[PDB]
């Protein structure tokens, strides 16, 4: 598997280099978010009301990306539908605050529709 | 312009995905192929980049190991 792994690595490397060179706001946003472990669980939709589900690893990521019922990601606004902790258990937007934050089982999963 | 660059990149990405064995899902592979074709046929950068956000999102949602921090480490460590 090693020649194949070497090619695979060289290809992934070139790919992210090309992505850097493109220097696109949206791609940079989803790549950067992914480096901090904020990752989409499904394909990012391009149409209204369509469901995006992404993992939010912690409260810093959370508050950087979320204001009110609004989630901002891949250069777009998404209207938050639900949040659920790691127990599948729902979580209100008001329970997510600096005080109550360590009381939550992270990561959260945000489900939201495109604006 | 940068249109040829995005398009070229979409072809590489579709490859990276195929290399990750994304073909074992007929549904997901068909989805990737379609986004790739849409990018190549895009007449405006906007359409090309939006379709590209969707396609790239396939690779990022794969827990697998595209693992990015590791590539960056490789990149940093050489220049």
From Swiss-Prot, chain A:
Recorded superkingdom: Viruses
Included range, full protein: 3996 to 4110 of 7073
Consequence recorded when altering residue 90 to H: In strain: Isolate ZJ01
Protein name, per record: Non-structural protein 8
Subcellular location: Host cytoplasm, Host perinuclear region; Host cytoplasm; Host endoplasmic reticulum
Subunit structure: Interacts with nsp7, nsp13 and nsp12 to form the replication-transcription complex (RTC): nsp12, nsp7, two subunits of nsp8, and up to two subunits of nsp13. Eight copies of nsp7 and eight copies of nsp8 assemble to form a heterohexadecamer dsRNA-encircling ring structure. Interacts with ORF6 protein.
Function: Forms a hexadecamer with nsp7 (8 subunits of each) that may participate in viral replication by acting as a primase. Alternatively, may synthesize substantially longer products than oligonucleotide primers.
Source species: Severe acute respiratory syndrome coronavirus (SARS-CoV)
Swiss-Prot record, chain B:
Protein name: Non-structural protein 7
Localization per Swiss-Prot or TrEMBL: Host cytoplasm, Host perinuclear region; Host cytoplasm; Host endoplasmic reticulum
Primary role: Forms a hexadecamer with nsp8 (8 subunits of each) that may participate in viral replication by acting as a primase. Alternatively, may synthesize substantially longer products than oligonucleotide primers.
Domain of life: Viruses
Impact upon substituting residue 75 to V: In strain: Isolate Shanghai QXC1
Portion of the parent chain present: 3837 to 3915 of 4382
Taxonomic path: Viruses, Riboviria, Orthornavirae, Pisuviricota, Pisoniviricetes
UniProt subunit comment: Eight copies of nsp7 and eight copies of nsp8 assemble to form a heterohexadecamer dsRNA-encircling ring structure.
Domain RdRp Nsp7 cofactor intervals: 1-79
